[PDB]
Design a protein around this ligand. Structure first.
Ligand code: NAG
Ligand code: NAG
Ligand code: NAG
Ligand code: NAG
Ligand code: NAG
Ligand code: NAG
Lengths: 596, 99
C-alpha cells in the first residue's frame, strides 16, 4: 500500500537473502584464509562476484523508493545505506579502469620485493624480511637503504597509478553528490534527521584540529624526549633543534613508535612486567589463553562464547601441509557464526591480541538482534575501540595478578608505571600526528587544494610541521611516498585510528567511573564490575541503529569526541616528561638542520 | 546448506489458529499487478531456510512437535496408561476394577 510498508517488505527480503549470501561469501573467504588453495580462491572470487552483483541489483531496486516519504529512522537509515551507487554511477570503462587499478595496486603492494643492488639473486618481502630489520636494526645506513629503496621502487611504480586513482575517485564522488572523495569518507560520521544529535561532514575536520591542538604539547614533550634518546643512540645524525630522521622511528612508515621502547626506556635497571616466562613455565596453551579471556568477559557481565566458536575457530597454526594467513582476524560470518583466525603464540602480545579480537567478537554478537544492513558499528571508530579497551584492561598488572600470571609480591612503584605509560604513549600517542597529517593531506589532495605537481613539497612540509619528522634526502614528484602504506594503497579510510584512539580513552574513563575505581586511570581494571558491563552492553546492543553521538551520550555523557580522557590517562607521564625536558628544548624546527 | 525447509515470509493478513497456507502465489506488496513475474514490489512469499551444522544455536534447526488436546462430545479414547497395582487376595482391601 504505502511507500513505507513497501520499503519495509523490501528490506525484509533484502535482509533475509543478503544474510545467507553474506554467509556463503564469508565462509568462502574463511576457507581461503585457513586453506590457501586455488579452488578456494576461485570459490571466494565467485562468491564475491555474486555478493557484489546482488548488492548492485538490490541498490538498483532500492533507489526507486524515495527517501522523504519515510519517517521511521531505522528504515530510512537502511534505505540510505542501500541506495548508495558506489562505483555504479560511474561509466563502465572508468569503473573497469578503477577496479583494474585497485587490483594492480593490491598485487604490487602484496608481492613487492626489494633487495640490495649487486646482490639480486634473492630478495625479501616487506612483511617479514624488512619489518624485522626496521624494528630491530641499529645501523643508520642499512635502515636508510631499506627505506629509500622500498620507497623508490613502490613510489615510482605507484605514482601514475595514484594520479589516475585520485581523478577517478573524485569523479565517482562528485557523481555521487559529494564534494570530493574525502567528503565521501567523512560521510560515515554524518548524522541527519535527529534533533540535537545531528553531525555534519564539515564538523569532523574542525573537531580533529580542535583535539589535535590539545594533543600537541604532550606530543611535543614526547618528541623531545625521543629525540634526546635517539641522539644518545645515534650521536651525530640527530640535531638538538631539528626533526627526527624518518628511517629511525622503529617501523617502515612511522605508523607506530613501539619499537623504540628499548632505546628510549626511562628505567632500564628496573624490571619489566613480562609474563611470557610464567606462561611458558606453566605450559599455557592458546586454548587456555582464550578461556582466560572468556573468564574476563564473563567477569564484567558480557555473554560467553558459543560452542560453535570453540568448535570452528582456528586458534593454532595448522601445520606445514596447510597454509594459512598469520594475521589475527575476527570473523562475523553471519547467522550467529563467530570465529577467530589467529596463529597464537605464547607471548604477551598474542594474549592482548586475543582479548582485542574477542572484544571484536563480543561487539559482533551484541548487535546480532539488529537487521542485517544495520549490523555494524555506529561509526568505524567504535568497532576497534571496544577491542582496544579490552587491550587496555588486560595489560594492567592487577589483571595479571588476579589471574595468577604475575607474582602477588611484585612491587608496583612509580618507575614501572612511568616506563609502561611511555610504552603505551609510543604505541598510542605517536600514531596520532601521523594519522592526522595523512588524512589532512589526503583530504587536501581530493579537495584540489594541492595540485599534482606540488604533492610532495607540501607533504614533507606537513610532516615537518605536524609529525616533526624530516626527510633524509629531498624527494621529487617521481616518488609516491604515501602509497607505500597498506591502508592508503588499498582504498581504506585512515581516520578510524584517530577516532578509535580518542574513543578508547573516553570509554575507559566511562567504564572506570562505572566500576568506581578511585585511583589513576592507567591503574584501572574493569573486571568484576557488572554495572560497567551493562553500560557497555547498552551501547553494544544498538549497533548502527542509533547515531554515534547518542551512543557516546549513552556511554560517556558527551555529544562529541573528547581529548581530555587521553590527557588524563597520561598525566603522570606528562608531568614526568615536563620535569625531564627542563634542560632540553621542547618542540622542533621545520628547517633542514639535522640532515637533508 | 539444507534448503528443503521453507517458511512463508509475507502474507496480506495474519493466519487463523490451526491454519495451513500452502499457496505459492506471488505476494503483491504494491499497487501494481505482479502479473505472475517476480519483479519490483512483487516477491515470492515462500523462502528457503539454509541450515548448516556450523551455525549458531539461535539459527540451528529445531524440530517442534505441538500436541493439541481437545475434548468433544464423542467418547474419549486417547487415555493415559492407568497403572495396575499387584493383586492381593484374602484381605480386606479397596478394589478398583475397570472403574
Ligand atoms: C585444505 O585443503 C587441502 C587441499 O584440498 C585438503 O586436502 C584439506 O582437507 C584441507 N583442510 C581443511 C582443514 O580444510
Ligand atoms: C521502525 O520499523 C521497525 C521495523 O521495521 C519497528 O520495529 C520500529 O518500531 C519502527 N519505528 C518507529 C519509530 O515506528
Ligand atoms: C544513483 O545513480 C543514478 C543514475 O546515475 C541516479 O539517478 C541516482 O540518483 C543515484 N543515487 C544516489 C543516491 O546518488
Ligand atoms: C556459557 O555460560 C553458560 C552459563 O553461564 C554455560 O552453561 C555454558 O556452558 C557456557 N558456554 C560454553 C561454551 O561453555
Ligand atoms: C618515585 O617516588 C619517589 C618517592 O617519592 C621519588 O623520589 C622518585 O623521584 C619518583 N620517581 C618518579 C619517576 O617520579
Ligand atoms: C573477579 O572474580 C573472580 C571470580 O570470582 C575472582 O577469581 C577474582 O579474584 C575477582 N577479581 C578480583 C580483583 O578480586
Amino acid at each position: 500500500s504505502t511507500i513505507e510498508e513497501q520499503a519495509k517488505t523490501f528490506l525484509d527480503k533484502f535482509n533475509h537473502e543478503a544474510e545467507d549470501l553474506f554467509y556463503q561469501s564469508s565462509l568462502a573467504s574463511w576457507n581461503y584464509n585457513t586453506n590457501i588453495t586455488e579452488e578456494n580462491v576461485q570459490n571466494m572470487n565467485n562468491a564475491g562476484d555474486k555478493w557484489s552483483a546482488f548488492l548492485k541489483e538490490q541498490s538498483t531496486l532500492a533507489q526507486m523508493y524515495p527517501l522523504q516519504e519515510i519517517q521511521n529512522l531505522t528504515v530510512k537509515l537502511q534505505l540510505q545505506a542501500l541506495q548508495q551507487n558506489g562505483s555504479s554511477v560511474l561509466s563502465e570503462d572508468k569503473s573497469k579502469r578503477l577496479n583494474t587499478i585497485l587490483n594492480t595496486m593490491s598485487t604490487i603492494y602484496s608481492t613487492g620485493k626489494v633487495c640490495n643492488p649487486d646482490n639480486p639473486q634473492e630478495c625479501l618481502l616487506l612483511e617479514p624480511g624488512l619489518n624485522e630489520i626496521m624494528a630491530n636494526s641499529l645501523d643508520y645506513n642499512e635502515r636508510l637503504w631499506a627505506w629509500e629503496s622500498w620507497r623508490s621502487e613502490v613510489g615510482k611504480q605507484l605514482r601514475p597509478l595514484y594520479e589516475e586513482y585520485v581523478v577517478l575517485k573524485n569523479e565517482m564522488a562528485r557523481a555521487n553528490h559529494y564534494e570530493d572523495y574525502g567528503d565521501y569518507w567523512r560521510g560515515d560520521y554524518e548524522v541527519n534527521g535527529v534533533d540535537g544529535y545531528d553531525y555534519s561532514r564539515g564538523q569532523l575536520i574542525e573537531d580533529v584540529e580542535h583535539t589535535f591542538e590539545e594533543i600537541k604539547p604532550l606530543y611535543e614533550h614526547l618528541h623531545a624526549y625521543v629525540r634526546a634518546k635517539l641522539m644518545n643512540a645515534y650521536p651525530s645524525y640527530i640535531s638538538p633543534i631539528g626533526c627526527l630522521p624518518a628511517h629511525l622511528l622503529g617501523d617502515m612508515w612511522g605508523r607506530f613508535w613501539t619499537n623504540l621502547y628499548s632505546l628510549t626506556v626511562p628505567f632500564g635497571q628496573k624490571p619489566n612486567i613480562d609474563v611470557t616466562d610464567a606462561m611458558v613455565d606453566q605450559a599455557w596453551d592458546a586454548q587456555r589463553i582464550f578461556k582466560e579471556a572468556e573468564k574476563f568477559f564473563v567477569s564484567v557481565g558480557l555473554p560467553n562464547m558459543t560452542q560453535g566458536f570453540w568448535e570452528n575457530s582456528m586458534l593454532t597454526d595448522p601445520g606445514n601441509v596447510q597454509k594459512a594467513v598469520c594475521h589475527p582476524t575476527a570473523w562475523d560470518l553471519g547467522k550467529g557464526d563467530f570465529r577467530i583466525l589467529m596463529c597464537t603464540k605464547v607471548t604477551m602480545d598474542d594474549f592482548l591480541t586475543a582479548h582485542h579480537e574477542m572484544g571484536h567478537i563480543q561487539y559482533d554478537m551484541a548487535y546480532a538482534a539488529q537487521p542485517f544492513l544495520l549490523r555494524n558499528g555506529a561509526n568505524e571508530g567504535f568497532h576497534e575501540a571496544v577491542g582496544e579497551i579490552m587491550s587496555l584492561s588486560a595489560a594492567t598488572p592487577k589483571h595479571l595478578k588476579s589471574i595468577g600470571l604475575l607474582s602477588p609480591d611484585f612491587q608496583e612503584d612509580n618507575e614501572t608505571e612511568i616506563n609502561f605509560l611511555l610504552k603505551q604513549a609510543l604505541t598510542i600517542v605517536g600514531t596520532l600526528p601521523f594519522t592526522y597529517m595523512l588524512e589532512k593531506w589526503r583530504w587536501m589532495v581530493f579537495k584540489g587544494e594541492i595540485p599534482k605537481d606540488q604533492w610532495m613539497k607540501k607533504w614533507w612540509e606537513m610532516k615537518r610541521e605536524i609529525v616533526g619528522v624530516v626527510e633524509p634526502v629531498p624527494h621529487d614528484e617521481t616518488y609516491c611516498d604515501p602509497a607505500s602504506l597498506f591502508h592508503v594503497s588499498n582504498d581504506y579510510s585512515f581516520i578510524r585510528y584517530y577516532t578509535r584512539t580518542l574513543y578508547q580513552f573516553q570509554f575507559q574513563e566511562a567504564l572506570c567511573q562505572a566500576a568506581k575505581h578511585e585511583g589513576p586511570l592507567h591503574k584501572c581494571d574493569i573486571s568484576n564490575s557488572t554495572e560497567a558491563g551493562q553500560k557497555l552492553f547498552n551501547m553494544l546492543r544498538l549497533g548502527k541503529s542509533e547515531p554515534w553521538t547518542l551512543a557516546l551520550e549513552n556511554v560517556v555523557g558527551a555529544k562529541n569526541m573528547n581529548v581530555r580522557p587521553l590527557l588524563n590517562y597520561f598525566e603522570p607521564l606528562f608531568t614526568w616528561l615536563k620535569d625531564q625536558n627542563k634542560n632540553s628544548f621542547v618542540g622542533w624546527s621545520t628547517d633542514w638542520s639535522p640532515y637533508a | 546448506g539444507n534448503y528443503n525447509y521453507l517458511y512463508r515470509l509475507f502474507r496480506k493478513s495474519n493466519l487463523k489458529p490451526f491454519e495451513r497456507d500452502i499457496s505459492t502465489e506471488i505476494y503483491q506488496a504494491g499497487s501494481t499487478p505482479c502479473n505472475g513475474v517476480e519483479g519490483f514490489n512483487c516477491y515470492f512469499p515462500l523462502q528457503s531456510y539454509g541450515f548448516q551444522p556450523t551455525y549458531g544455536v539461535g539459527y540451528q534447526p529445531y524440530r517442534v512437535v505441538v500436541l493439541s488436546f481437545e475434548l468433544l462430545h464423542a467418547p474419549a479414547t486417547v487415555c493415559g496408561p492407568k497403572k495396575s497395582t499387584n493383586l492381593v487376595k484374602n484381605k480386606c482391601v479397596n478394589f478398583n476394577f475397570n472403574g
